[PDB]
Design a protein around this motif. Structure first.
Motif, PDB file in Angstrom:
ATOM      1  N   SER A 161       1.734   9.352  -1.200  1.00 25.07           N
ATOM      2  CA  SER A 161       0.886  10.500  -1.511  1.00 25.07           C
ATOM      3  C   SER A 161       0.650  11.362  -0.279  1.00 25.07           C
ATOM      4  O   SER A 161       0.890  12.577  -0.298  1.00 25.07           O
ATOM      5  CB  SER A 161      -0.445  10.028  -2.094  1.00 25.07           C
ATOM      6  OG  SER A 161      -1.394  11.082  -2.103  1.00 25.07           O
ATOM      7  N   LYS A 162       0.169  10.745   0.803  1.00 23.70           N
ATOM      8  CA  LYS A 162      -0.150  11.509   2.011  1.00 23.70           C
ATOM      9  C   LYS A 162       1.067  12.263   2.545  1.00 23.70           C
ATOM     10  O   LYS A 162       1.017  13.484   2.772  1.00 23.70           O
ATOM     11  CB  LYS A 162      -0.714  10.573   3.077  1.00 23.70           C
ATOM     12  CG  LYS A 162      -1.997   9.886   2.670  1.00 23.70           C
ATOM     13  CD  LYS A 162      -3.097  10.909   2.470  1.00 23.70           C
ATOM     14  CE  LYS A 162      -4.415  10.248   2.130  1.00 23.70           C
ATOM     15  NZ  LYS A 162      -5.488  11.255   1.915  1.00 23.70           N
ATOM     16  N   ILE A 163       2.166  11.539   2.773  1.00 22.74           N
ATOM     17  CA  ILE A 163       3.362  12.138   3.355  1.00 22.74           C
ATOM     18  C   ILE A 163       3.893  13.246   2.458  1.00 22.74           C
ATOM     19  O   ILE A 163       4.320  14.309   2.935  1.00 22.74           O
ATOM     20  CB  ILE A 163       4.418  11.047   3.600  1.00 22.74           C
ATOM     21  CG1 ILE A 163       3.920  10.082   4.673  1.00 22.74           C
ATOM     22  CG2 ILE A 163       5.741  11.663   3.999  1.00 22.74           C
ATOM     23  CD1 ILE A 163       4.559   8.725   4.602  1.00 22.74           C
ATOM     24  N   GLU A 164       3.871  13.018   1.145  1.00 20.85           N
ATOM     25  CA  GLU A 164       4.336  14.023   0.202  1.00 20.85           C
ATOM     26  C   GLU A 164       3.500  15.283   0.318  1.00 20.85           C
ATOM     27  O   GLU A 164       4.040  16.392   0.323  1.00 20.85           O
ATOM     28  CB  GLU A 164       4.284  13.469  -1.219  1.00 20.85           C
ATOM     29  CG  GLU A 164       4.337  14.528  -2.305  1.00 20.85           C
ATOM     30  CD  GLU A 164       3.663  14.079  -3.586  1.00 20.85           C
ATOM     31  OE1 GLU A 164       3.186  12.926  -3.637  1.00 20.85           O
ATOM     32  OE2 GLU A 164       3.607  14.878  -4.543  1.00 20.85           O
ATOM     33  N   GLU A 201      -7.624   3.649  -7.976  1.00 19.92           N
ATOM     34  CA  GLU A 201      -6.648   3.825  -6.904  1.00 19.92           C
ATOM     35  C   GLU A 201      -6.981   5.044  -6.051  1.00 19.92           C
ATOM     36  O   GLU A 201      -7.038   4.962  -4.817  1.00 19.92           O
ATOM     37  CB  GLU A 201      -5.246   3.953  -7.498  1.00 19.92           C
ATOM     38  CG  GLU A 201      -4.152   4.102  -6.462  1.00 19.92           C
ATOM     39  CD  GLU A 201      -2.768   3.940  -7.052  1.00 19.92           C
ATOM     40  OE1 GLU A 201      -2.566   2.998  -7.848  1.00 19.92           O
ATOM     41  OE2 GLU A 201      -1.881   4.754  -6.722  1.00 19.92           O
ATOM     42  N   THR A 202      -7.237   6.181  -6.696  1.00 14.71           N
ATOM     43  CA  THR A 202      -7.557   7.384  -5.941  1.00 14.71           C
ATOM     44  C   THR A 202      -8.913   7.272  -5.263  1.00 14.71           C
ATOM     45  O   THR A 202      -9.087   7.767  -4.139  1.00 14.71           O
ATOM     46  CB  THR A 202      -7.522   8.607  -6.855  1.00 14.71           C
ATOM     47  OG1 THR A 202      -8.464   8.435  -7.919  1.00 14.71           O
ATOM     48  CG2 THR A 202      -6.137   8.785  -7.443  1.00 14.71           C
ATOM     49  N   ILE A 203      -9.877   6.600  -5.900  1.00 16.33           N
ATOM     50  CA  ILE A 203     -11.174   6.453  -5.254  1.00 16.33           C
ATOM     51  C   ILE A 203     -11.063   5.589  -4.006  1.00 16.33           C
ATOM     52  O   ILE A 203     -11.639   5.918  -2.968  1.00 16.33           O
ATOM     53  CB  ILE A 203     -12.220   5.909  -6.239  1.00 16.33           C
ATOM     54  CG1 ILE A 203     -12.638   7.016  -7.201  1.00 16.33           C
ATOM     55  CG2 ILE A 203     -13.430   5.375  -5.496  1.00 16.33           C
ATOM     56  CD1 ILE A 203     -13.574   6.555  -8.258  1.00 16.33           C
ATOM     57  N   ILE A 204     -10.342   4.468  -4.081  1.00 18.06           N
ATOM     58  CA  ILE A 204     -10.199   3.627  -2.896  1.00 18.06           C
ATOM     59  C   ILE A 204      -9.367   4.327  -1.828  1.00 18.06           C
ATOM     60  O   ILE A 204      -9.573   4.101  -0.630  1.00 18.06           O
ATOM     61  CB  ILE A 204      -9.612   2.246  -3.252  1.00 18.06           C
ATOM     62  CG1 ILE A 204      -8.169   2.366  -3.739  1.00 18.06           C
ATOM     63  CG2 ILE A 204     -10.490   1.541  -4.278  1.00 18.06           C
ATOM     64  CD1 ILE A 204      -7.481   1.036  -3.954  1.00 18.06           C
ATOM     65  N   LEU A 250       0.822  -1.203   0.000  1.00 21.34           N
ATOM     66  CA  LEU A 250       0.000   0.000   0.000  1.00 21.34           C
ATOM     67  C   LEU A 250       0.861   1.260   0.000  1.00 21.34           C
ATOM     68  O   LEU A 250       0.387   2.344   0.351  1.00 21.34           O
ATOM     69  CB  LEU A 250      -0.944  -0.028   1.205  1.00 21.34           C
ATOM     70  CG  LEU A 250      -2.118   0.946   1.332  1.00 21.34           C
ATOM     71  CD1 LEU A 250      -3.032   0.838   0.126  1.00 21.34           C
ATOM     72  CD2 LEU A 250      -2.891   0.680   2.611  1.00 21.34           C
ATOM     73  N   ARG A 251       2.125   1.126  -0.407  1.00 18.62           N
ATOM     74  CA  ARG A 251       3.099   2.205  -0.269  1.00 18.62           C
ATOM     75  C   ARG A 251       2.671   3.478  -0.991  1.00 18.62           C
ATOM     76  O   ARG A 251       2.991   4.582  -0.538  1.00 18.62           O
ATOM     77  CB  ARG A 251       4.465   1.736  -0.765  1.00 18.62           C
ATOM     78  CG  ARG A 251       4.432   1.062  -2.117  1.00 18.62           C
ATOM     79  CD  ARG A 251       5.605   1.491  -2.970  1.00 18.62           C
ATOM     80  NE  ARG A 251       5.641   2.939  -3.117  1.00 18.62           N
ATOM     81  CZ  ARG A 251       4.993   3.606  -4.062  1.00 18.62           C
ATOM     82  NH1 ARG A 251       4.250   2.983  -4.962  1.00 18.62           N
ATOM     83  NH2 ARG A 251       5.092   4.929  -4.105  1.00 18.62           N
TER      84      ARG A 251
END
Lengths: 257, 33, 142, 97, 45, 264, 32
Positions: free
Chosen positions: B8-11, F92-95, B2-3
């Motif tokens: 995305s979040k951390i960035e 991917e973005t939706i999940i 799930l990396r």
């Protein structure tokens, strides 16, 4: 895969409700292939060249029987094919006549953004020739300002066909607009002069039009509706919004921003 | 795994941080002077 | 990994468009650009929402289709990072789009700002066009 | 690539002409407006002037039975509220800069 | 530094300290001389 | 645009139109957004055949528009069409935003699950636990061991501490994370309680930190019981060590209480 | 490690913006 459209009722008597079969024809042509090509099976024109016909004759029947939404649909699909693919034949014969008709319809429903927007995509035929297309823009130019005698003169001059369907609507939307505009142009009118400046004759129609509005008569006299003085001599609303404005000036003047 | 999600979040958080840091660094000086 | 690649690639897919501009199709360039736009603008904010928009609009008008739907709803209207060079042509394009649809009040101000954002260099290529339009539209407005 | 924009300029020309005529004279017969603006017909000049009056281009009235157009006199704009708006519109700018 | 480039259509194939007023060119349409108009108008009447 | 013939009633013609639209939406998302409400009308008609298909194209449109809440609504509505999870950035973005909404709602319910919640969509927790299982099979257990906290769900945590990893490493890691960073007692005490019994379950009874956990949450009776069990092992060595570790860090009140349990 | 890359970022985001508050008040008191 058959030329059912070759059995097209036309000649001088196409009165029969072709729609009953036309619906099945459109259903089968859609169920065949390439109703909208996107990009595929190029150089195959029987499903394509026929579709243009199976849409032009549909749209003409559509204008005859007054089906505004169905006409809009046919206009959309035919405007797609006319432009998208330039590997086809010249099409022609009816392209300009239909395009002019579409522009006329846009004018009839009083949308002036789309008429200008769709004036584009025509290279130079606006003045090159294309009388079927010089007429709509000329009518629009005459209509944009007060020139109206030329509009009614041209209403009897259409090289394409009758076009009563749209020029009618145009006559109505000119009558009501002139009735609205005369309400403030001048103080008094004579009844004969009023009846003649508006293009109707002397029927009970003039009486009814006056009844629909006010237009109270006198001895061969028309009274002017006069007010034009309610707005002036007011300060309280200014006396509030000026206060708001001055407070706004002082707001961002001494505080650090 | 799930990396990607975590990246995305951390960035996004780290991208935001710098603007704030900058807009505070100027503020400290004025007070010191 | 685009802590540099992004602002390096901008120029790349700006000359890339010129390549097709001088030669063959542009429709599939439009398809690619459309894809690439959402390929970006989803990695948080990455820029390119300036160059790709201009690339898309450069010949969207040239093909003579005045679609405007996406421009009023575009989320890339505000990259805010344009080096004061992209912003000028973006404003010019949106000003002509607005002016072609019987809207004159706002086109004057936006495209005058665009013109006066132009740099000092001797070349006057685009300034010729913007001036010409900026005075046609002012004749039109009142 | 600019024929389509400038092809619609006739209305601006006619508006400028009628505004100039209104500002210059005060009482003029329409039997000369057509000749001055070369519309080749006097009757449609009535419609043109009526449309002009509609949009507030000019406040002149018209005696259709007679034919002459007479215009009102509106001076002393200094007492009007508009100059305050004009000053405010740039007070805002000078405070923003 | 000084990148200053634009892509397309460079063209055209390559003073006055009095502030400009439009009116000066209006009668540049004709009436070359007040003289000529007066001289060649007065004679009629 | 072809959306014109969406005004026709025939379902076969709708199933022609939609299967063009879903193939071309990528390049016309704004022009179709002009009318997507009509596609919501087709989604509303429970009588309509192939009803599920409209939800997918609507989700694509709203995804292109950034209306990600509405995109998630109609992604759930399209349901099993999201059996594909493996390629497109769309899914991917939706999940991901699904994960975010779910965790935020679960944190909200961490006050009280019975707190008059909006009923959970089984599709939502379905796909979220499906992606959790995906993370398990990818061997990326260091993700799961973290995310187990933010779902605020204890049973999945109690399970997944047993996995391909060696239990004690991930267990100690997670307990350290909890003691360091967990923001409130309300959840921390539950997590500690539910976990640490593993040390009485594990093939080695690891009392040494059980004392620690039973003094971070005070339970004199429990530690006295495990102490008595060690005593009845007739081995003093660990029963000595555990209690001398206790003395260095227990409260005077705690000792003066547990004396009662130990003496009687 | 990868979870700390979220926790520490949250913690710095928390700690910053409280730096803002005292400086904001201090500039007020200073002129006073």
């Amino acid at each position: 895969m058959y030329e059912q459209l070759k059995g097209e009722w036309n000649r001088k008597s196409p009165n029969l409700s072709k729609c009953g079969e036309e619906l099945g024809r459109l259903k089968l042509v859609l169920l065949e292939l390439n109703f909208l090509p996107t990009t595929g099976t190029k150089l195959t024109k029987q499903q394509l060249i026929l579709a243009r016909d199976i849409l032009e004759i549909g749209a003409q029947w559509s204008i005859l029987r007054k089906d505004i939404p169905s006409f809009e649909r046919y206009m959309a699909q035919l405007k797609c094919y006319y432009f998208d693919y330039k590997e086809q034949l010249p099409e022609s014969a009816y392209m300009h006549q239909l395009l002019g008709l579409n522009l006329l319809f846009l004018l009839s429903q009083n949308r002036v953004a789309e008429f200008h927007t769709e004036l584009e995509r025509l290279p130079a035929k606006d003045i090159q020739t294309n009388v079927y297309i010089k007429h709509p823009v000329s009518l629009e130019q005459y209509l944009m300002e007060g020139s109206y005698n030329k509009v009614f003169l041209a209403k009897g001059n259409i090289p394409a066909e009758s076009y009563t369907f749209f020029i009618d609507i145009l006559l109505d939307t000119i009558r009501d607009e002139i009735a609205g505009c005369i309400e403030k142009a001048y103080e008094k009118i004579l009844f004969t002069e009023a009846t003649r400046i508006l293009f109707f004759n002397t029927p009970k129609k003039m009486t009814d039009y006056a009844k629909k509005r006010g237009w109270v008569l006198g001895p061969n006299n028309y009274y002017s509706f006069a007010s034009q003085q309610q707005k002036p001599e007011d300060t309280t609303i200014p006396s509030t919004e000026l206060a708001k404005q001055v407070i706004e000036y002082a707001r961002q003047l001494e505080m650090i921003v | 795994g799930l990396r990607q999600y975590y990246l995305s979040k951390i960035e996004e958080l780290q991208l935001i941080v710098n603007d704030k840091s900058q807009n505070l660094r100027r503020l400290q000086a004025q007070r010191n002077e | 990994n685009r802590r540099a690649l992004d602002l390096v690639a901008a120029k790349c897919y700006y000359y890339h468009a010129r390549v097709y501009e001088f030669l063959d199709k542009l429709d599939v360039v439009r398809s690619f650009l459309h894809a690439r736009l959402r390929t970006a603008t989803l990695r948080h904010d990455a820029d390119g929402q300036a160059t790709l928009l201009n690339l898309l609009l450069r010949n969207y008008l040239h093909y003579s289709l005045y679609d405007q739907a996406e421009k009023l709803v575009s989320k890339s209207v505000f990259p805010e990072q344009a080096n004061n060079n992209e912003w000028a042509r973006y404003l010019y394009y949106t000003g002509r789009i607005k002016a072609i649809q019987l809207e004159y009040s706002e086109a004057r101000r936006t495209m005058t700002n665009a013109l006066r954002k132009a740099p000092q260099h001797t070349a006057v290529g685009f300034k010729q066009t913007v001036h010409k339009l900026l005075i046609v539209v002012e004749l039109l407005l009142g | 690539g600019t024929y389509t924009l400038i092809i619609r300029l006739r209305h601006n020309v006619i508006k400028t002409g009628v505004r100039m005529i209104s500002l210059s004279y005060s009482r003029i017969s329409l039997a000369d407006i057509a000749q001055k603006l070369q519309l080749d017909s006097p009757e449609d000049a009535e419609f043109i002037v009526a449309k002009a009056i509609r949009d507030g281009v000019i406040e002149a009235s018209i005696n259709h039975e007679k034919g002459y157009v007479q215009s009102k006199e509106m001076i002393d704009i200094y007492s009007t509220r508009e100059p305050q708006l004009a000053f405010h519109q740039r007070i805002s700018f000078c405070l923003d800069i | 530094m000084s990148e200053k480039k634009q892509p397309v259509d460079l063209g055209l194939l390559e003073e006055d300290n009095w502030d400009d007023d439009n009116v000066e060119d209006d009668f540049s349409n004709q009436l070359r001389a007040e003289l000529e108009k007066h001289g060649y108008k007065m004679e009629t009447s | 645009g072809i959306i014109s013939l969406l005004d026709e009633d025939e379902p076969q013609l709708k199933e022609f139109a939609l299967h063009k639209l879903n193939a071309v939406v990528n390049d016309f998302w704004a022009e179709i957004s002009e009318s997507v409400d009509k596609i919501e009308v087709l989604y509303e008609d429970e009588g309509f055949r192939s009803r599920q298909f409209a939800a997918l194209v609507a989700s694509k449109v709203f995804y292109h528009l950034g209306a990600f809440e509405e995109s998630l609504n109609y992604a759930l509505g399209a349901g099993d069409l999201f059996n594909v999870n493996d390629n497109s950035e769309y899914v991917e973005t939706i999940i991901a935003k699904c994960i975010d909404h779910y965790t935020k709602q679960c944190v909200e319910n961490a006050d009280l699950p019975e707190g008059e919640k909006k009923p959970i969509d089984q599709r939502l927790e379905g796909i979220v636990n499906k992606m959790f299982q995906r993370c398990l099979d990818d061997h990326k257990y260091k993700q799961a061991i973290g995310i187990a906290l933010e779902t605020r769900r204890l049973d999945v945590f109690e399970k997944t501490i047993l996995e391909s990893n060696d239990v004690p490493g991930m267990l100690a890691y997670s307990l350290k994370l909890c003691m360091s960073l967990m923001q409130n007692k309300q959840f921390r005490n539950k997590v500690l309680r539910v976990l640490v019994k593993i040390y009485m379950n594990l093939e080695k009874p690891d009392f040494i930190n059980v004392c620690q956990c039973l003094i971070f949450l005070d339970d004199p009776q429990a530690v006295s019981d495990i102490l008595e069990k060690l005593v009845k092992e007739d081995n003093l060595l660990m029963a000595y060590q555990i209690c001398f570790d206790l003395y260095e860090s227990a409260s005077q009140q705690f000792l003066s209480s547990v004396i009662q349990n130990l003496r009687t | 490690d990868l979870y700390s890359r979220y926790k520490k970022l949250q913690q710095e985001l928390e700690f910053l913006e409280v730096q803002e508050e005292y400086i904001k008040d201090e500039q007020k008191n200073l002129k006073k």
